Symmetry: C4
């Protein structure tokens, strides 16, 4: 077992091909399935796992009532092989209402945040044991990525924020070796609010695309140097912006450096990645709600401010159907590093009042150098047939 | 771990012996069990797995209503060790309403087709990662074997069709190395319609027996050369024909080359294999419906046009009970390659209107060089005791 | 991985200590648990597994009605790690209404009998593949041990019977190498009826204690020489006899050679083993019914005809509670071979008419060279609280 | 695989960080989950497992009625990976109404006590086989730790008691090598009543902190020398005492040697460990009931009689919520041995009469050298929403 270095070129990407779907809401109506939100995917050198924050209950269960809330002492991080739905034999790997996980080539790191809003604790669990912890620095909901961290040569990086959801906050990037925090770098650069980073290896460093919850509907970028620990930050250049809410495609803007101040408050976790001058990105189809999901390439979208020249659109979830969070993960192939993404498909309250609970299923796609057609892969639960 | 070459002689076969049964419909009445159809069996060098296309629901579940339909975005390929029924802890290995899987000696390949009828995508997943994809070439339900593919020296072959179910279509044979499509050969030869191939290693190549959905109640043969990529095709010589529907045993014919034009439209997935001049084959007992299942050898049935000299009949499922799809798989023994087969036992709509769902169980037999008796191994669900 | 030779002395035994219990009937009232009978235990070099013949249904299931019957096409052999109850994720390793399993040091052999009463088939499955089969020789319920077979230096032995349950029958001992039948020896010697043998390694050969269903309430012994394939047989010398039904302890007899002709018809699977001149044995406490279970040593019970000098009695199941089948298994320790046994605890019809089903749980004890106390470990299901 | 020696220094501890929670009571209301009590945690060199004494039933099950009782023949020791709740696929590793388990670096030892109150048997199971047993010496509820044993260089130690719960009893320390009892040392020293020891490696020996059920609300210490087999004992010096019941913090006392005679009768399993002159310890917040759970360091609490100088308090379970048993486990890191603890969260009768059953969930924390905040992690079941 050697440490991952991710020192291969990024794979050619012509778009994305179907990879996985768990259909967990449909199954919940005829089986004991965990209530979840904030899912993600991360893979060890051999195989992929799906993760989510449990609500400490199954769906067909009186405890599922009012599971819309984000933070309780009963939330734990679930971990199954990808494609295995969260049944009662699912392992809860730590106590968490915010998490990030990654494999360094040798073992799994889990970063798990729980406790009081005003004084939370993050535990660092590596190779099945607790190695480190840190208390809240700003005493206002310490929180992390809700997707995979990234490790190079045994140094794993994870982005965490503490402080306001609607003003300047204190974001820090932790460097972790075999579960031990060896360095913490405060955020630097021009990103003005950073949450829920979707990070990927871009040898020799790590690159993240995140959520600005304050003034931006354009997505922040954070670049992390694992050798000198320097942090830089800015915004995705693309004038087709990635956050929800946002303005329409003709009114939206981004000039690469500053929050656009266009329906900037609130947000959704999302992702994008660079290919030379171009960007690949996903987003909800709706500009207001977490409904629909589309991916596309913006020509010049990485290096040219405010570019809106799109190509290679794919519908992942049709506009009539609910989506949610999305995030990136990276998979090492024979000769290149591939980029994949998941979409959380949220069902229940508050939007759907037919039931009392709030949960999600997942759908997953991976980059391809081949060809593909079209479809739509929504949750598929019939809200009127569900246990309430 | 070395690549499979399958370079051993075929085992002596005197008939088939019971190997596995999952009883999943009976269990569905008292437990959370997936709704499935189109099952199959494939084995790695150590052990066998059962596969099926899920309907994204369990049977005792309101979502099981009207699961007769062939293609939805909720269908996924299930994979368990053979004999483990599709319980809620079953892994969904990809999104699929048509699939083929095989192990090359080192890792599993899955071929999975999903998306719009008119523009489907096939994903190629090898060793737990997406390696390739292809879009629909004829824009009319791209589809594949619904049974195991076959790999020799690391080249895996899979037969796919796109186009009409009731006229000339575009069948292609893909050659896949570690999940990457390295070559695609169009169908050639005298088979006029080819679907749902049951393929087996016949060193140095691959041989398939398939479904003609158009003009043949005789089964097509496709031979695949993995070195020069040439394809040839014809029909099983046996005058006792293998498809359903078909004419009676006295009226039926085949002359080895052309569809017989005898109740040729429609069909069922099935199998046959050669032993010198003789053929072993299975088929439904009913000539009209997917009811009963019998196996036998036809003396001269491989090389003599229209031979009807049968011997070594076995009843697998009595004529009063429902069958369905069937297919071949191959298992490497100490000194020879054995041939085995599964039978899908379909229950529910449209034939049985007592329930709203459509599902199946499975029964599995393997070739033997020993002796055996008689029996009948049907599904065993009591349609009047089932959840509706 | 080397073949087991079992070439160590038998461990010192002062009695038996509790090893396992699965409590499956109690669990069946609040969970999806298989309906079973005829359970047994066998261990690979590392760990033990529990086995049973399923009835192709869970208990809380309409299909559990009238599961008293011995033989159906839905019965399969279940296999879990010992102590894991037969939940819905349990593997069905073959189709069987009669079975025997054993590990040769390298891999598992399963012997599985299914099909028509008058023309059954036994499949031989080794290392996950079908290697051999044999048809019924006497056309009257081919059947086997319902407990572990035994392998020495890669030759596995299994005792099978075909023919009358109430007159002279045709018993044969099969010698099996990597799943292939290499030799079959007919029963020889003075045992007049032999069923359901409980066999154990007694280097350099195999020794079995069985059920006489015809004229004996004394238990037959069959000795198997794995080098020259010779079979000899007689009866356990002990005047305290092991079968049910039987006469009382003062009226019972055995003189080592012939069936005692004392309430000889019918029987129950059971076990005994030798220690020099002494015998260890178990039996039901009731002389008429399968109720209670006791173990003891008979001083002189192996070599002295009709000895009744007992010592070291233990109650395993109190006389007020139901038992059933019992059988031996052997476990290799550091320096000796230990002997253990299981007891099937049968619940339901026909004896208990409060429910419609027939099932069992299990309890397991192992020989000890240490000390122990007393107890009683019955099924524990409350028949009046069970699903019907 | 080498034997554990635990020959590293104890880790720096500044307090404890969240590690695991299973939420099993909440899940029990919508899924088949075992009824348990007396849980614990023990880890092999790679990963941690959770253990508990089952009641031979799931919670949503008529057999769960009146599961308040401590000892039945249906109780078994359950073992899952830590964080996997006790679902129906959980392994029952032995028959037990009292247990201790530990891994010696090569294999698992289980110590399991069952049978009649007046004549119980303890089985010693190592590497999946029964190696030894001992009968009750004092004929009055032979019993053990209900938490992990400890092994050094292949010698495992376990503390057992037989005799009165309310007067002088017969405690013995067993030394076990590969499952075989090689030596038994009677308790010696000034501890006057010793039950339910929480033991940890303190190279070159083993140290335990236990429950005095008779005259002490201060906790006994037992030190075990694994080389010369000598036993010494006393009481934790801290004037803030660890048992429940106890007097208030101002009235309580301990002078290190003798039971304090302060509300000494009854007790709860608990833990403490030394760091030079200081002690870390947990206890219920309530002085009368098993409610709340707090941890803290007492400065001088190991070596200075009656010290009450506390620092580094953490609330684990708020005072309004139920706790129960607690115990220590040790985890080997890169350069030091860490100390962790679990808390049993008891729900149901007799305290909560809304339901008929008695069960528990668990929460687990590990020592940290980092920082942390605050929270409360109670069971979380709504007693008014539970199946009864
Ligand atoms: C079977 O499946 C395949 C694979 O999914 C699918 O092919 C894909 O089709 C989509 C939709 O057409 C393609 O994505 C589009 O790409 C165009 C640019 O490509 C065209 O123009 C260039 C340059 O001239 C040519 O080289 C090229 O050949 C094409 O002709 C983008 O313009 C598209 O974006 C617009 O349309 C979207 C809706 O489709 C809008 O959502 C989006 O906002 C854009 O609209 C606005 O921008 C336009 C200018 O960009 C302008 O007209 C207005 O401002 C407008 O309002 C979109 O990204 C994708 O590349 C194809 N994939 C591949 C690999 O070929 C097949 O269509 C499908 N067949 C069926 C019937 O199912
Ligand atoms: C216990 O279990 C064993 C194993 O399953 C079983 O033995 C098997 O019996 C079946 C049924 O008889 C055998 O299969 C048949 O084989 C004959 C040919 O074999 C005979 O003829 C040759 C050549 O002269 C002899 O060497 C040989 O010894 C036999 O006498 C086929 O003719 C059979 O096919 C016909 O009958 C079927 C129904 O059984 C029809 O479905 C089928 O359509 C065929 O019917 C038509 O063809 C006939 C000419 O072929 C002619 O009469 C008419 O056209 C007719 O309508 C069938 O394949 C099988 O070989 C045996 N297996 C072995 C290994 O021996 C025992 O019977 C069983 N016992 C019981 C009581 O359960
Ligand atoms: C705590 O747990 C331990 C371990 O389980 C338990 O000890 C065991 O007790 C049983 C029951 O007494 C013992 O088994 C009996 O052994 C005697 C022979 O031993 C005695 O005699 C010899 C020779 O003189 C002495 O060396 C020895 O010290 C003993 O005194 C057998 O006779 C017993 O069989 C008879 O009684 C059974 C009921 O207990 C009947 O079911 C059985 O049919 C026998 O009855 C008939 O035979 C008698 C002559 O054999 C005669 O009296 C009449 O014919 C009669 O009707 C039985 O096998 C066992 O050896 C002990 N185990 C060990 C290791 O010591 C403790 O008793 C237990 N304590 C409590 C209170 O729970
Ligand atoms: C965010 O999260 C952090 C980490 O959990 C938390 O910090 C921790 O706070 C607790 C509670 O204050 C600290 O534990 C206490 O420590 C004091 C001793 O520390 C003080 O005094 C020393 C010596 O002068 C100073 O060096 C040091 O800086 C501190 O000022 C103990 O006295 C505390 O025990 C008493 O209070 C408890 C309730 O909090 C009682 O339950 C307990 O019985 C004690 O009460 C009695 O004793 C007193 C003297 O000891 C005396 O006043 C009376 O007799 C009294 O009745 C307690 O152990 C802990 O050390 C902090 N942890 C760290 C690592 O700093 C933050 O508070 C938290 N913030 C929020 C708002 O959530
Ligand atoms: C995209 O949003 C812009 C900005 O709101 C829309 O432009 C406005 O449209 C209304 C008429 O519907 C006018 O009264 C306003 O003067 C416009 N505002 C500005 C600032 O231009 C535009 O219509 C939207 N485009 C689409 C296609 O919906
Ligand atoms: C097999 O099918 C053939 C073809 O239909 C049947 O032959 C027909 O039988 C009817 C009488 O029932 C006659 O009126 C027709 O003239 C026949 N047609 C031909 C073309 O021969 C034959 O009877 C069937 N055999 C069996 C055993 O059912
Ligand atoms: C054991 O069984 C024998 C054989 O039946 C019993 O002896 C019989 O008892 C009855 C009186 O109850 C007499 O009328 C018969 O003459 C006896 N028959 C013989 C052949 O002796 C004996 O009583 C039984 N022993 C016990 C303890 O139940
Ligand atoms: C702790 O317990 C002590 C001992 O009972 C309490 O002291 C008693 O308090 C009552 C008044 O409430 C007096 O009448 C007794 O004289 C006291 N007894 C002794 C022996 O001192 C003390 O009040 C308790 N402390 C707290 C904070 O509850
Ligand atoms: C720690 C926490 O509660 N994070 C929140 C997150 C957060 O409110 C925003 O990013 C603003 O800061 O929003 C959302 C959301 O759906 O918008 C869900 C997350 N829920 C959970 N991770 N549990
Ligand atoms: C891709 C697809 O829908 N294939 C069909 C197949 C097909 O309709 C015929 O071969 C004609 O082309 O028929 C059947 C069938 O039962 O006849 C089931 C298959 N269902 C699934 N594989 N899902
Ligand atoms: C193959 C078969 O049916 N064997 C029978 C067995 C048999 O009837 C007797 O030994 C007489 O021959 O009896 C019993 C029994 O409980 O007495 C159960 C077995 N049931 C099963 N193994 N399924
Ligand atoms: C063997 C046994 O029954 N031990 C008891 C234990 C015991 O009563 C006291 O320590 C007094 O001796 O108390 C308790 C308790 O909750 O106080 C539970 C234990 N239950 C179980 N381990 N099953
Ligand atoms: Ca925003
Ligand atoms: Ca056809
Ligand atoms: Ca008999
Ligand atoms: Ca006490």
């Amino acid at each position: 077992a050697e440490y991952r270095n991710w020192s291969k070129p990024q794979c050619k990407i012509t778009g994305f091909a179907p990879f996985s779907k768990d259909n967990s809401i449909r199954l919940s109506a005829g089986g004991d399935i965990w209530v979840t939100r904030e899912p993600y995917v991360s893979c060890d050198p051999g195989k992929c796992y799906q993760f989510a924050l449990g609500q400490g209950t199954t769906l067909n269960n009186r405890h599922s009532n009012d599971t819309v809330h984000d933070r309780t002492p009963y939330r734990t991080l679930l971990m199954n092989e990808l494609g295995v739905p969260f049944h009662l034999g699912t392992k809860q790997v730590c106590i968490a209402w915010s998490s990030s996980s990654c494999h360094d080539g040798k073992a799994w790191l889990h970063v798990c945040v729980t406790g009081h809003d005003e004084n939370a604790t993050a535990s660092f669990i590596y190779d099945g044991r607790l190695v480190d912890s840190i208390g809240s620095w700003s005493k206002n909901i310490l929180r992390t990525q809700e997707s995979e961290c990234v490790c190079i040569n045994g140094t794993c990086t994870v982005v965490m924020t503490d402080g306001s959801a609607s003003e300047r906050a204190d974001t820090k990037i932790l460097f972790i070796e075999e579960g031990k925090i060896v360095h913490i770098s405060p955020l630097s650069g021009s990103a003005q609010h950073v949450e829920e980073c979707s990070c990927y290896p871009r040898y020799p460093g790590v690159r993240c695309v995140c959520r600005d919850n304050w003034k931006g509907s354009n997505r922040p970028i954070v670049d992390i140097n694992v050798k000198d620990y320097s942090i830089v930050s800015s915004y995705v250049c693309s004038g087709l912006v990635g956050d929800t809410p946002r303005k329409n495609d003709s009114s939206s803007s981004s000039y690469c450096r500053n929050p656009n101040n266009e329906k900037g408050s609130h947000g959704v976790k999302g992702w994008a990645f660079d290919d030379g001058n171009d960007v690949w990105m996903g987003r909800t189809i709706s500009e207001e709600l977490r409904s629909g999901y589309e991916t596309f390439k913006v020509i010049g979208g990485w290096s040219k401010p405010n570019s809106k020249l799109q190509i290679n659109r794919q519908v992942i979830v049709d506009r009539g159907n609910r989506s949610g969070y999305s995030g990136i993960f990276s998979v090492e192939g024979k000769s290149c590093i591939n980029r994949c993404f998941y979409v959380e498909l949220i069902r229940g309250r508050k939007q759907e009042t037919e039931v009392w609970w709030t949960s999600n299923s997942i759908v997953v796609f991976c980059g391809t150098s081949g060809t593909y057609g079209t479809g739509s892969w929504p949750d598929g639960g019939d809200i009127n047939l569900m246990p309430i």
